[PDB]
Amino acid sequence: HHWGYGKHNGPEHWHKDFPIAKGERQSPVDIDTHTAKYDPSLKPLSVSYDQATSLRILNNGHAFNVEFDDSQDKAVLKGGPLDGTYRLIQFHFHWGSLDGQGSEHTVDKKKYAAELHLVHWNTKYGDFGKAVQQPDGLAVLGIFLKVGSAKPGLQKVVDVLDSIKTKGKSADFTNFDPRGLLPESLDYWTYPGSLTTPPLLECVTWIVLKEPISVSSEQVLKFRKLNFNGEGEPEELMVDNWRPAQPLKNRQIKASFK
Ligand SMILES: NS(=O)(=O)c1ccc(CCNc2ncnc(Cl)c2[N+](=O)[O-])cc1
Ligand SMILES: [Zn+2]
């Protein structure tokens, strides 16, 4: 009986195995655009993905992760609100059963069709596993998806999904360029929070872009053909794998833009 999103094991149940679920800096949150303060000391985000090396894509039974070789100083995130340099390790999405829901963060309560998380760990902690143990260990760059025009840079990911339909399947996934998934503007909101899945650790500086990317209805439909179950188990479509907004508690959301 471990965690998931279904009835019986979804987000309102996670606190029983992961008490930090009701902690002081949980994610996601609703971004109240009128209350976020412009912070003229924030820097432009620096996203250096030219040398990114993807390795593999994996259906882990919650989502699919596109995994990177993070053994050298390649795909990094810095600047913005960050001190130091954070290294890309994987990306994944959260999406809905319908286009009216799916994102984890919301903007003035607006839910987008999906949300992309590019996960980076602080190189001062030497690896991902040690980083998640620190309050400034991770930087996750969150990008909203709306349904409209297709995102050509997404299509390679969409096409490999029928090879990892079920939990525990993986596939070779090299030379995937994540610059294809970024909107034009890097205007962002930022606040301190957590992993949005168990173990829900409070180790994340969240950077959420204001500009969504557009993906097609056929693209997001293919996400929804994935399965939560393993091969040879009864089919449970992989939909609604998002955690709802959690209490903001004392925290400030800062905006990089006027
Ligand atoms: N949705 S999100 O906030 O962007 C996000 C959620 C979860 C993760 C990592 C979850 N995996 C782990 N987390 C913590 N410790 C270990 Cl040791 C692992 N682990 O798997 O070995 C990364 C990002
Ligand atoms: Zn995520």
Side-chain angles (χ1 to χ4, degrees), residues 160-174:
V160 75
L161 305 178
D162 81 291
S163 74
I164 55 152
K165 189 163 112 100
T166 47
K167 176 169 58 172
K169 297 215 170 288
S170 66
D172 302 321
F173 200 71
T174 66

Side-chain angles (χ1 to χ4, degrees), residues 39-50:
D39 180 354
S41 72
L42 288 169
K43 297 182 168 66
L45 251 202
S46 169
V47 190
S48 298
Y49 289 164
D50 46 289

